[PDB]
Amino acid sequence: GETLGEKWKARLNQMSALEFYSYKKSGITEVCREEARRALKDGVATGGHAVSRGSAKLRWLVERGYLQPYGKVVDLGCGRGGWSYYAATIRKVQEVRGYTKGGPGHEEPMLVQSYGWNIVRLKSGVDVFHMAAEPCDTLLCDIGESSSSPEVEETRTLRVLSMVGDWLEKRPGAFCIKVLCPYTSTMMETMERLQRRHGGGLVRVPLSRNSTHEMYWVSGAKSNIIKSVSTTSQLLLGRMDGPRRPVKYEEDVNLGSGTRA
């Protein structure tokens, strides 16, 4: 039958514009980047500003031990490079290689001089679905385009997991993989089978908007799949019910500046 997340998705799609706008950010955490945007647009590269919202996302996981990056970091779907630049500041990290689609209507890699920028190399014009897996120590992937269709979201997620599968054959010790749609029955079953092989678990990052059920498959988690997904689904459902809570604003990550080693 219908899962809680599938219930959540249907209710989400049935919302008026007003109810949706009121819900999307109710009680969530958010980093304010109006300062970062301005400096970056002005061409400031040494201010320690993150290139995107994603640095704070990855930081939330790493700070809590859900992820311990090290060695060669591969960042699939790196966009502007928020995850790559953050990882560059982590001690045991020696190399960062990001790959992203780029092109019209898609984020291009950004060049800044935040701490450890010298071990970072970002590559645009790359379809990771066409890229052969390589050796890596830490595997990051943040691919998963949202959609109103639960069918599309499900299919898109399982295609990413199929693609990530080949990279996981190389046994990275650490990983962080975005799972756009983890709430269907098939998806929970799939993740369980992936867990008993590769380990890790699903984690909800509070910086995510309420309008998405995205969770992150991280090597440092050890929780039950169904229980973790169900808990998140209930939270998102609960927030649809009143009251509208304000956004918990935090200050964005600062990544310092200068070269490493």
Ligand SMILES: C[S@@+](CC[C@H](N)C(=O)[O-])C[C@H]1O[C@@H](n2cnc3c(N)ncnc32)[C@H](O)[C@@H]1O
């Ligand atoms: C949600 S963004 C995450 C960016 C990054 N995590 C950050 O902190 O800035 C995902 C990125 O993956 C890229 N992407 C989506 N599909 C891709 C594909 N098939 N191959 C390469 N990149 C892809 C998109 O262009 C998008 O910029």
